[PDB]
């Protein structure tokens, strides 16, 4: 029936940019226009230095930009001529008012919905791509119906994104699945199938799953919650191991070889970070409370409480090992990003571990091979940062004269440091706190050198 030939995407961020670049790369006969109110970001997308780094993104953008891929600030015209409008704007957690710290702020979504229906005539498919609360598409449909024009036919779909930081291009070109939600109406099914035809240019039909709108919105939140639960579950086991003499890596391996459980996302850690795990679980908890489902709410709250407990007890282990006082002591923080091979620090466990040690008056020397130094200062600010926080240029400066080395991010270079050299210039006794299990197999060497080595999920 209907064929999508022109695509507009509102939001040229971590999601809108790469997704539309790949669609343009895979669909040569489709014009794809990405729009954003942030002009510096849009100009960056047309500049030869893109505003977000993803492996393979530069080659894909440069192969389409100007031909069928466009980045613009002319939002109204892009909406006007588009057959399909992606909504890919930010939905941050509300930091204010009712639902503070749990509910999502929908003001940017609503601004899009108002601006879309203002600049639209005829038939258009509007697709929710941002992570939204369940039934948010009902709000968009209400706004569209309450501002309808003659011959204005706007169809609303849900199409969540599942890409992860660092592998976006591979995830977009070979996705585990593409998820599309729509109404069970004849009009909805025509819009769902039209969006399926776009993805069918490079995604097998067997990988394209179509559901109703609410199942699609809920699936995005639930998927991230299931992932975070695996991390919190194995972290809860790490605490059991420390008290029993078991080893969390051995237990995780034994658990993960059951193919019904799987062997992915069972790496114990000081705690999961990233911009979406805590946000999506807390949103789920808030949604359940609003729907009078307190049992479900407290069920998923345990994922967050366990992650916070894993962080706090790790900070307590450092403080207790350092003779119950770390005031004016130099402590090396190796790793500040929430995972390796990135500079993103949002909700990184290094932030919370650092603030715990700062509350005790410790002198932190933080080294991360990729995180910008200005970001670390901003993250540790609410003064206290000037007195206590020092950003080192290399790990050996951070460990010079330190009582303990705290590894919070699994950077591969930390495995290869010269620890006999580090031990010589550390105050004695010297401690290593491995919050990522990156030094496994090196404990006998480190103990022979003279370190007291402690790691998560291993009895001391």
Ligand X SMILES: NC(=O)c1ccc[n+]([C@@H]2O[C@H](COP(=O)([O-])OP(=O)(O)OC[C@H]3O[C@@H](n4cnc5c(N)ncnc54)[C@H](O)[C@@H]3O)[C@@H](O)[C@H]2O)c1
Ligand Y SMILES: O=c1ccn([C@@H]2O[C@H](COP(=O)(O)OP(=O)(O)O[C@H]3O[C@H](CO)[C@@H](O)[C@H](O)[C@H]3O)[C@@H](O)[C@H]2O)c(=O)[nH]1
What's the CA gap between 307 and 192, in Å, rounded? 38
Q: How far is the CB of 88 from ligand X (least distance, A)?
A: 5
Q: Is 345 annotated as a binding residue?
A: no
> Least Å distance between CB 160 and ligand X?
6
Q: Exposed, middle or buried, 185 (CB in 10 Å: 0-12/13-18/19+)?
A: exposed
Lookup: tokens for 102: 């749990």
Q: What's the half-sphere exposure (Cβ side, CA atoms, 13 Å) at 94? A: 15
288 is catalytic: no
Binder of residue 14, out of ligand Y, a second copy, ligand X, none (CB less than 5 to 8 A by kind): ligand X
Report whether 434 contacts 455 (CB < 8 A). yes
Binding-site string for ligand X from residue 255 to residue 294, where x marks contact by CB under 6 A and - marks none: --------------------xx------------------
**Which CB, 41 or 365, lies closer to ligand X?**
41
Distance (Å, whole) CA 424 – CA 132: 53
Is 239 labeled as ligand-binding?
no
Comparison of 197 and 222: residue with beta carbon closer to a second copy: 222
- Using alpha carbons, list the distances in angstroms from residue 34 to 43, 45, 81, 139: 12, 10, 13, 24
* Of residues 189-228, those binding ligand X (CB under 6 A): none
Q: Give the residue with the Cβ less far from ligand X, 131 or 354.
A: 131
Per the CB < 8 A criterion, the answer to whether 422 and 428 are in contact is no
The least CB distance from residue 102 to ligand X, in Å, is 14
Q: Which of 27, 36, 229, 311 binds ligand X (CB under 6 A)?
A: 36
Residue 164, annotated as binding a ligand = yes
384 labeled binding residue: no
- Burial (CB count <10 Å: 0-12, 13-18, 19+), residue 78: buried
- Active-site annotation holds for 425: no
One-character DSSP codes across 134-193 = TTHHHHHHHHHHHT--TT-EEEEEE------TT-HHHHHHS-S-EEEEE-SSHHHHHHHH
Out of ligand Y, a second copy, ligand X, none, what residue 176 binds, judged by CB under 5 to 8 A for its kind, is a second copy
Q: Is 269 annotated as a binding residue?
A: yes
User: Which tokens in the block code for residue 132?
Assistant: 């939204």
9: annotated active-site residue? no
Given the DSSP bridges, would you call strands 69-72 and 153-158 parallel, antiparallel or unpaired?
A: unpaired
The annotation status of 273 as a binding-site residue, yes or no, is yes
Q: Choosing from 94, 124, 220, 329, which is the catalytic residue? A: 220
Question: Which does residue 158 touch among ligand X, a second copy, ligand Y, none (CB within 5 to 8 A, set by kind)?
Answer: none
Choose the one of ligand X, a second copy, ligand Y, none that binds residue 307, judging by a C-beta under 5 to 8 angstroms depending on kind.
none
Pairwise CA distance, residues 392 & 398, whole Å: 6
Q: Is residue 272 classed as helix, strand or coil in its secondary structure?
A: coil
- Summarize as ranges the residues that interact with ligand Y (CB under 6 A): 162-165, 224, 227, 231, 265-267, 269, 272-277, 338-339
Burial of 428 (0-12, 13-18, 19+ CB in 10 A): exposed
86 annotated binding-site participant: no
Interface positions, 61-90, toward ligand X (CB under 6 A): 75, 88-90
From CA 274, how far away is CA 222, in angstroms rounded? 16
Q: Is 91 in the site for ligand X (CB under 6 A)?
A: yes
Catalytic residue among 128, 161, 217, 347: 161
What mask of x and - would describe binding to ligand X in positions 116 to 145, judged by CB under 6 A?
--------------xx--------------
Q: Which segments are annotated as binding site for NAD(+)?
A: 11-16, 36, 41, 89-93, 130-132, 165, 276-279, 346
Query: Which residues belong to the active site?
Result: 161, 220, 276
Q: Which segments are annotated as binding site for substrate?
A: 161-165, 220-224, 260, 267-273, 338-339, 436
């Amino acid at each position: 029936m209907f064929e999508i030939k022109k695509i507009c995407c509102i939001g040229a961020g971590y999601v809108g940019g790469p997704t539309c670049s790949v669609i343009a790369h895979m669909c040569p006969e489709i014009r794809v226009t990405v729009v954003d109110v942030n002009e510096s970001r849009i100009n960056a997308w047309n500049s030869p230095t893109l505003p977000i780094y993803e492996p393979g993104l530069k080659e894909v953008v440069e192969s389409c930009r100007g031909k069928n891929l466009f980045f613009s600030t002319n939002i109204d015209d892009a909406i006007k001529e588009a057959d399909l409008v992606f909504i890919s704007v930010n939905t941050p957690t509300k930091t204010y008012g009712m639902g503070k710290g749990r509910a999502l702020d929908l003001k940017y979504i609503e601004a899009c919905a108002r601006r879309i229906v203002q600049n639209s005539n005829g038939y258009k498919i509007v697709t929710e791509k941002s992570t939204v609360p369940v039934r948010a598409a009902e709000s968009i449909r209400r706004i569209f119906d309450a501002n309808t024009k003659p011959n204005l036919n706007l169809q609303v779909l849900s199409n969540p994104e599942f890409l992860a930081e660092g592998t976006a291009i591979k995830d977009l070109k070979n996705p585990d699945r593409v998820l599309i939600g729509g109404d069970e109406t004849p009009e909805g099914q025509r819009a769902v199938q039209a969006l399926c035809a776009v993805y069918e240019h490079w995604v097998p039909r067997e990988k394209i799953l179509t559901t109703n709108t609410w199942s699609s919105e809920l699936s995005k939140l639930a998927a991230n919650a299931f992932l975070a639960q695996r991390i919190s579950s194995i972290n809860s086991i790490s605490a059991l191991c420390e008290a029993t003499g078991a080893d969390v890596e051995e237990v995780a391996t034994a658990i993960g070889m059951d193919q019904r459980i799987g062997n992915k996302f069972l790496k114990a850690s000081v705690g999961f970070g990233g911009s979406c795990f805590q946000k999506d679980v807390l949103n789920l908890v808030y949604l359940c409370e609003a729907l009078n489902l307190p049992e479900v709410a407290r069920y998923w709250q345990q994922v967050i409480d366990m992650n916070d407990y894993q962080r706090r007890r790790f900070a307590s282990r450092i403080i207790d090992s350092l003779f119950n006082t770390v005031t004016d002591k130099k402590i090396a923080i190796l790793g500040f990003a929430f995972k390796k091979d990135t500079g993103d620090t949002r909700e990184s466990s290094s932030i919370y571990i650092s603030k715990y040690l700062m509350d005790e008056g410790a002198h932190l020397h933080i080294y991360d091979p990729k995180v910008p130094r200005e970001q670390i200062v901003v993250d540790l600010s609410h003064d206290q940062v000037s007195r206590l926080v020092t950003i080192s240029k290399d790990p050996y400066e951070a460990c010079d004269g330190a009582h303990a080395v705290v590894i919070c991010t699994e950077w591969d270079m930390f495995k290869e440091l010269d620890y006999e050299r580090i031990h010589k210039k550390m105050l004695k006794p010297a401690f290593i706190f491995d919050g990522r299990r990156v030094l496994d197999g090196l404990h006998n060497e480190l103990q022979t050198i003279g370190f007291q080595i402690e790691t998560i999920g291993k009895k001391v």
